[PDB]
């Protein structure tokens, strides 16, 4: 049975529609050939990061008033120091073919993402706005401008640089801003603002880093794409546009995209739109949220570490540790190490000693007076 | 705690233990005809106490 091909008028061929939900559906088993889009969006975190609190959630997605302290040191606290936001999405199994010693992994194609709530910024009559001249009205959200997004199959690699060393950040108590001092141990060095090598870390936590003192890391994050934007300024205009056409590509030069390591997906993200003018004169930074339409497919690649090697890796430091007398490194207690292979016509010296070139190659020493 | 079986990962199977069938039945049934305890309740005067139930 078919239906008559001149009778029956033809149509395009979009790709096909398996299902449409929420994150309880990415459980279901998907062909080789497979394509997953995930729609999801990230509220700002910038020192007032809750609003469950029943204190203090008058101020979500906003600053508490800055001020230079006018007197060394600085002593800022958590509520005036705005940091990224991150967050993780889990993503299922796939398959693995051991006989081939291949699997297969997640990668990211595209993003199609845009800044929400732009359209709030035209609010210029908040009851406490700093007018800009008498019987005027409200001076609209302005001022600096900090945008940065990324994604990638690992948390994302940071930089650690801070305007002043002399700053005393708070400590880290079980909860609170992460920085260069809590990374080294030690106390900022003016090395530190400079680069410095040594401070490094990982965005492992929300809320937590601020953008003061951290910055993306350009040589470690080989697996994350991220892009960037600023503008500094009293109360310079804020500009921004939006639209759900334009979107982003994240393959490489090599054709490939971020690898989702442990099935999990890595997003971060920050965006600050300006300052809120007081009618006090005091003034406090505010942001916004951001929108991820990130789209996914199956990719093969080859086991890099072959399973063999991790698991006698794997064991070993299971194992019950064995504390014996030294036998390798600085001070062995090893003082000969042959080998041998296959049979050669007998050598002159028996206390020839051979090794083997820096190029692989077989040598021979020819013995020399030892000084 | 069973032991452990065969595998073979070239076809991608294994070996688990299956339970298929299960006997069972309540050991000292017999013991609660005991209507002497030395603190049981007589289930009248000058009577027996009052069996397990
Ligand atoms: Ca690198």
Excluded at 143 to 164: C, K, R, S, T
Excluded at 271 to 283: A, C, E, N, P, R
Aim: aromatic letters at 8%; glycine letters at 8%; one cysteine or more.
């Amino acid at each position: 049975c078919i239906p008559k091909p001149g009778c029956c008028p033809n149509v395009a061929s979009v790709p096909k529609l398996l299902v449409k939900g929420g994150v309880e559906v990415l459980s279901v088993v998907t062909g080789e050939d497979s394509i997953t889009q995930i729609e999801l969006y990230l509220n700002p975190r910038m020192g007032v990061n809750s609003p469950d609190l029943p204190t203090t959630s008058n101020w979500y997605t906003y600053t508490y008033d800055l001020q230079p302290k006018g007197s060394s040191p600085d002593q800022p606290i958590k509520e005036n120091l705005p940091a990224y936001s991150v967050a993780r999405v889990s993503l299922p199994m796939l398959n693995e073919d051991i006989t081939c010693d291949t699997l297969q992994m997640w990668e990211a194609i595209s993003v199609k993402t845009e800044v929400v709530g732009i359209s709030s910024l035209i609010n210029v009559h908040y009851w406490d706005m700093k007018r800009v001249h008498d019987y005027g009205a409200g001076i609209p959200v302005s001022g600096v401008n900090y945008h940065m997004f990324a994604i990638g199959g690992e948390p994302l690699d940071l930089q650690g640089l801070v305007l002043d060393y002399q700053t005393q950040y708070p400590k880290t108590t079980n909860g609170g801003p992460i920085t260069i001092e809590t990374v080294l141990g030690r106390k900022m060095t003016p090395k530190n603002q400079g680069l410095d090598p040594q401070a490094k870390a990982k965005l492992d936590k929300d809320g937590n880093y601020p953008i003061e003192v951290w910055c993306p890391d350009p040589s470690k994050n080989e697996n994350s794409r991220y892009y960037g934007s600023i503008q500094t300024g009293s109360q310079t205009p804020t500009v921004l546009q939006f639209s759900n056409t334009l979107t982003t590509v994240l393959l490489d030069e090599n054709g490939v995209g971020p690898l989702c390591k442990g099935d999990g997906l890595f997003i971060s993200c920050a965006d600050i739109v300006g300052f809120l003018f007081k009618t006090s004169g005091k003034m406090a930074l505010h942001g916004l949220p951001r929108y991820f339409n990130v789209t996914l497919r199956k990719r093969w690649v080859k086991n890099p570490y072959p399973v063999v090697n991790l698991i006698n890796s794997l064991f070993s430091n299971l194992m019950p540790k064995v504390s014996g007398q030294p036998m390798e490194g600085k001070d062995n207690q090893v003082e000969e190490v042959r080998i041998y292979e296959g049979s050669e016509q007998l050598p002159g010296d028996p206390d020839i000693v051979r090794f083997l070139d820096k190029f692989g190659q077989e040598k021979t020493v020819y013995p020399k007076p030892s000084v």
